Amino acid sequence: VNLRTQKRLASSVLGVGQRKIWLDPNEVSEISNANSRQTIRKLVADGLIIKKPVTMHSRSRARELNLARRIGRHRGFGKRKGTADARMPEQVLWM
């Protein structure tokens, strides 16, 4: 069976991309008969078509660095790349 139009229809119904659409590999025969949007959203309620969760992008490593920056860590001359005027302009300091 060919289910390219099923992932295209399911992507539009569920509001996500085609990369986040899961069609049950053990139910492709019944999925292949879902030729309409009304049938597609019926399969979603039944559970044959599932929207995958987003891939996790955690930020806590950035939070840990910012907290260490607050208490004075990772600030030496070996961690500075821009000029002092770029890191903190004297126009802002005088202002």
- Spell out, one character per residue from 53 to 92, where the chain touches RNA: x when CB under 7 A holds, - when not: ----------------------------------------
Contact 37, 14 (CB under 8 A): no
Task: Tell the smallest beta-carbon distance from residue 89 to RNA (Å).
Answer: 22
Task: Tell the smallest beta-carbon distance from residue 68 to RNA (Å).
Answer: 25
90 DSSP assignment: H
| HSE-CB for 46 with a 13 A CA cutoff | 14
SS3 of residue 51 by DSSP: strand
Q: Which stretch binds RNA (CB under 7 A): 23-31, 34-42, 62-70, 82-90?
A: 23-31
Q: Which stretch binds RNA (CB under 7 A): 1-9, 40-48, 77-85, 86-94?
A: 1-9
Contact 46, 23 (CB under 8 A): no
